Amino acid sequence: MAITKPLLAATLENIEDVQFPCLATPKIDGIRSVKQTQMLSRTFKPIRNSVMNRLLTELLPEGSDGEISIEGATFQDTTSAVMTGHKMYNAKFSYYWFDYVTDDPLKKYIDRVEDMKNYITVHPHILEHAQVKIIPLIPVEINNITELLQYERDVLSKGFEGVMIRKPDGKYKFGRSTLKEGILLKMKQFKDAEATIISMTALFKNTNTKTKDNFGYSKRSTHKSGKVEEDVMGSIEVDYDGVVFSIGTGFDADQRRDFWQNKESYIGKMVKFKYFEMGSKDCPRFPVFIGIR
DNA sequence: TTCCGATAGTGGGGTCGCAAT
DNA sequence: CACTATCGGAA
């Protein structure tokens, strides 16, 4: 009945890959948190802001799954509030409750939602707290592409980050859902743009002592000591109409080679990339390389 | 054989903790 | 977060 590890989402690129009917909810741009005795982050480390942990641990039933978010605040402000080990904290904050694991993890998503609906009926006060606004996310039924697109337009106008899609009978998988599985899909709209390469930085292999983590995955520290330079491009620094930042994902092995081999000739060339607008502070959020020219 | 799931690993922006300054 | 490279087992 314990949540071995949080359910993660797969990315939807081709809307035709969606299996209908499906259950959708708005995507919250916040910080993940599951109640396992106390409030835990996505990596199962306790939530630093003891006041939030305490308040949520009390209001929510063991096995709750959701995201913490500050209404009207920037993403970074929400991050500061959640990641800071505040002694005392009085500001208002919300918690979007989107899943609930009771006894069996293999219970169908629709049923787990029913559990949420039932629990809320029995404890009305948990949505009335004066400091913590607990917002339940009951999925909406979408039967086709026309409906999904309409729903998307709707949640985006209301300020959400995007839309999350669930297979009705999907189990609560311990780990990341795949596309074929369709258990949990995220749907975000990225914006394409172009920028000029101004420099290149070499790729660095991390040879720090490989350990284990809260789940049993390979964990390696990032001490600059264990970082050994390789003869391939690690990231490029670009100039997006005055804004300077780096793009390091979206390259395959051959490209990292080609880029480093011709580091001289590529400086000054225009690259196409994409990024997510919402949440961007001083430069593009989630920059991903697409191509050249 | 080919495809797909599970991992390890490489990168980005940005904030907090905390020892050193 | 976004993404690539592998490996071993499912299809």
UniProtKB/TrEMBL annotation:
AMP binds at T25, P26, K27, I28, K186, K188. Coiled coil: none annotated. It comes from the Viruses. Its cofactor is a divalent metal cation. Keywords: DNA damage, DNA repair, DNA replication, Ligase, Nucleotide-binding. Residues 6-177 form the ATP-dependent DNA ligase family profile domain. GO terms for biological process: DNA recombination; DNA repair; DNA replication. The keyword DNA repair applies. Residues 230-293 form the DNA ligase OB-like domain. The keyword DNA damage applies. One of its GO terms (molecular function) is DNA ligase (ATP) activity. Belongs to the ATP-dependent DNA ligase family. This is DNA ligase. The gene is A544R.
